Design a protein that fits this description.
six-stranded mixed sheet, Nitrous-oxide reductase, oxidoreductase, homodimer, 2 domains, binds sodium ion, periplasmic copper-binding protein, dimeric, binds calcium ion, globular, five-stranded mixed sheet, binds dinuclear copper ion, EC 1.7.2.4, binds chloride ion
Chain lengths: 588, 584
Amino acid sequence: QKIHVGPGELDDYYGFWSGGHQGEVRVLGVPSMRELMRIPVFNVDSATGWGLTNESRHIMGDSAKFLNGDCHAPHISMTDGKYDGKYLFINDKANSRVARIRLDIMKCDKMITVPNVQAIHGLRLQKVPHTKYVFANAEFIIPHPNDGKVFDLQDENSYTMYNAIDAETMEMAFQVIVDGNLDNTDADYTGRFAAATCYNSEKAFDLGGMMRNERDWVVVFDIHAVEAAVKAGDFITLGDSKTPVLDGRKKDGKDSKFTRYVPVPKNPHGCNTSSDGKYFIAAGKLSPTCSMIAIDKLPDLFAGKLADPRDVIVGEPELGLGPLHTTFDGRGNAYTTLFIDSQVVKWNMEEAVRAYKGEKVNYIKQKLDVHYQPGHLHASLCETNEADGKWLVALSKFSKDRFLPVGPLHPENDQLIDISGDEMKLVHDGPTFAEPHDCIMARRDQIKTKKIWDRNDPFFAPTVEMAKKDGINLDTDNKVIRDGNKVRVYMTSMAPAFGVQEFTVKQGDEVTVTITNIDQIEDVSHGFVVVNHGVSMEISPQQTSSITFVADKPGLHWYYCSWFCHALHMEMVGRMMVEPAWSHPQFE
Amino acid sequence: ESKQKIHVGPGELDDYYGFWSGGHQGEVRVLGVPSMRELMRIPVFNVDSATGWGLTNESRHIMGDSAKFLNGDCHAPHISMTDGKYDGKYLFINDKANSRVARIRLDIMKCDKMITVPNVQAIHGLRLQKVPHTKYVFANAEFIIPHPNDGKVFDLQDENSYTMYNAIDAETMEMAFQVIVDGNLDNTDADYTGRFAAATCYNSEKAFDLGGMMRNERDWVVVFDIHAVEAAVKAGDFITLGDSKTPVLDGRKKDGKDSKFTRYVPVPKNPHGCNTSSDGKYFIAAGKLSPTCSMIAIDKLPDLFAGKLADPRDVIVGEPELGLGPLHTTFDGRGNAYTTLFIDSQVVKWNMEEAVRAYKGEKVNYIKQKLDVHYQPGHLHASLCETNEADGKWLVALSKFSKDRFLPVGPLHPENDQLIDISGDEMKLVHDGPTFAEPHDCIMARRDQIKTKKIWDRNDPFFAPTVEMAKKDGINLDTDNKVIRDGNKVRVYMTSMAPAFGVQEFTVKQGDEVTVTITNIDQIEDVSHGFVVVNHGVSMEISPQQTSSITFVADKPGLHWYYCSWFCHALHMEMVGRMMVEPA
Ligand code: CUA
Ligand code: CUA
Ligand SMILES: [Ca+2]
Ligand SMILES: [Ca+2]
Ligand SMILES: [Cl-]
Ligand SMILES: [Cl-]
Ligand code: NA
Ligand code: NA
């Protein structure tokens, strides 16, 4: 299997890395593991102006005031159990958000703050018949309402919720109150069932309390029952949110119609659907096991045909110390990270099932040492029925001496492994920044991108509407619109020249600069920086971008194109003239 | 023969550090060479969610008032030198967008000082004094502005409209002096004695439009007599501008008479790169609109400033014709120069002494090879090229239009930073490295030239101001877990030790201004902790033996979780605490 990509050769797969604590999404080529692009999401990006421009701040909404995010889990939208290449979704644990990235323009186009919860951690997409819903876990138990009258996690109104977001509209679809808490989650291959692990069935806040119970559980959701209750109006709402809320808790030992609790040891973490649709596999973390939940026994479970929720467990292989995450090669093998043993263990799911029934069989096929302390891992196409068993990435937290020292902070070691054969083969150590934690791979032919924007693209439609109110045709006009203490500069740009090369304002004016890049050739990006005003953005071909700032400094202030666009780029500049406040009417 | 190994396999280590400019994204990046893998990101002018640079009190203190900016625009990373060799102490880099120079300490790989250059706009080129050591950082301000810039005068042709050459004291990171020049400044370099520096000018016309800037057949390389400048400062013969105490010297021509501080050497045309050869013989200016480089003999500059030469052009000793669009030059230490040809889209290898002899009229071919690169190269960098130890092993050419060299990724494209083996007679392209936001230029150092710390010193100046605040509250940071109440201000101090915060709950009043100071008292390498307050925009990292702090207001009543962001321990997921906010 081709391991190295030489000059002029192209990678075979796209890789989509979580930006971890840094808050972006990163696009890699696989197997070279080179970073092809960064997609700003929850971070503020100086280069493209994401978080500064009006288009990006509009998408982020009120949360545009936050400069941070914390990502764990990127996933790609699916139709009939295969990637369709339309959207990537990712979480923000720091400020409780879900973001959607449009894979044709490789930009975040929608973002939502999940109401009435704290810390969006695990995130996973419905597989069948398509990604109708984004499932997202809120990790932490909070009071409802959280008005500062009650702080007790044990109070009857303290809880966290499982969240369903409508993938196309990016509005809340529903929420399900659960017992315990939520960690990771996955979905079946029918659309009926989803499942999530829980490490805090104790509803404790201290380390000892969260580890008391021998077993926590994975909670299973009957999505069809949830929908039928919504359509029937059998739900409540919390605070000012209109989101339908359904109660998935047990009440005095009696289950709700929406959930079932399958006991699993112990503080389990990963929750992974095998690519043949057979199992929800939970990683036991503090228990040296995984637990295999038979998805085809779920209907019986929810219909009372089983006495014990443990009856849906058909395997619980002992694997090693600190199992965290599981992936699949599509050949009947699972691969599980062992955080303490610092290994990836390859095991056969059907053989593990037969061992659970008493049959003495050795389901463990190989243990590969990794470097060191692996968290999550990802096999190519593992989340689809097309899992091709070619590549595996294990994302290890302590890289130690695997890379040159770079001071007190260390990179994550994202290790590429060849699994095309019977023997796992470590081939590349990929160091990464701010603990990406997890990633997703897609074949080259599963991703179709645009090189030139469409002029009607929703990403900047609000700006077109604004321009229209000013009587502006963005494809041609170079005009300075004045409106009291607001100035709205509209210009085209075509390398190497800004369409407006100087304009004059009063000190204190609120200036919006809107630039439409009318170059028609691929890869002619322009930039726009106002010196010493903290203003910076990128404009790609046929895109419109805008940014607003206050001209609070009298005098002449240069602006320049930051992105090399032409042999005469260094000369693509302009001048803002700011008339001193003492030469104009003075206010207080 | 050029035949170095390019593969760094699992378990093997890179041979060089590479320090990449973060370009328009504003950070510094540390790569391993020859793998070309990014080992670390060092936040500088960007706001970093992961470590809290731009949010923490220690980082905002370093940034000063400019902490209000969330952007930077970087081009020119350079490493401090002693006796013309890298000494591993500091990395310096420019911010063109908000007119700054930042210093990075290479032992901790963090920005530790930052300065806004007074009375200028757009710090672009930057370069370090080489000998006897990096006393000064030299920084170009690119754009001509009025003085004062108070909005009475906007005419760039006015007698008080000009830009300035900036010298920053490298060790104190305070301004040392500024030199007013004619025209504008592009790139700059320094000699191997400490007496001379030089910079290219493209806007000798002092025009604001594209046509007017390309008006003159020749611009120039302005040469600076730094000894003369220092002598005038020492004698008090200078002025100051506005509210800056920086000594300002007038380096402009006056009615055709030269300053004592400058000489203007005519060079074609809108020249860009300005590169000192590793043998110390030449300032080499890249011709850009002229298909040439011009070679200024550093040995002739003393006679030039002494008035012993009949024409400023006499210090020009070579002007090789190389190709279309020469922008930048580097050196292998074997006598060759390597120059980017933006238009021809090549790296041309040429022999400097043979060019000098050609300029005198000898029939000799100084061009050795042209290597196609992909595509439109800007700057280039050979290993140790800025030192008298230039080792002629690796060359990076940083090309702007990657076209079809990588998988498509939407309307934006990566820069193509191509690794080239120059160890033998023939340049060999060996690796295409895609990079984000046009790093533009980079600098390499041998592994043994960089020595980093794995554990912070408790006395480190980086968080000394926080140690001081802690003193005023009576806090021993190594041990204490205490909540100090002071009006509507709450100062939480805690140790942390994987997997537990030293303070796991505290209660405040809605509207309080909360400062959380965390001291990581783990003593094992690479056990970093994080601290994130959910839904409050608060995030930071704390490495072993570091103290880090962050301030935010508790504007939301109720229970609000905080958690450790960096995987520190098998029980990392359970390392959490609770902030309880009592309603007003
Ligand atoms: Cu337009 Cu550079
Ligand atoms: Cu401490 Cu994660
Ligand atoms: Ca538990
Ligand atoms: Ca010129
Ligand atoms: Cl998972
Ligand atoms: Cl240069
Ligand atoms: Na939204
Ligand atoms: Na400073």
